[PDB]
Amino acid sequence: XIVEQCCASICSLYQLENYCN
Amino acid sequence: FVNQHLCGSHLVEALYLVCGERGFFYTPKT
Numbered sequence: 459x460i461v462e463q464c465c466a467s468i469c470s471l472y473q474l475e476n477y478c479n
Numbered sequence: 480f481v482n483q484h485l486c487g488s489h490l491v492e493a494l495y496l497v498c499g500e501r502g503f504f505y506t507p508k509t
């Protein structure tokens with residue numbers, strides 16, 4: 459998931475936005 | 480915005496900045 463992707467790979471702020479409430 | 484390499488607590492800091500008062504869900508295994 460996003461937690462793993464951001465650390466093992468790279469991720470964007472736009473992808474992080476999908477986790478907002 | 481630039482791409483990100485975030486591990487541990489740094490990811491939580493990023494989520495806080497991106498989501499603000501809207502809140503967010505930190506979900507590892509997901």
Ligand SMILES: [Zn+2]
Nearest residue numbers: 486487488489
């Ligand atoms: Zn650190």
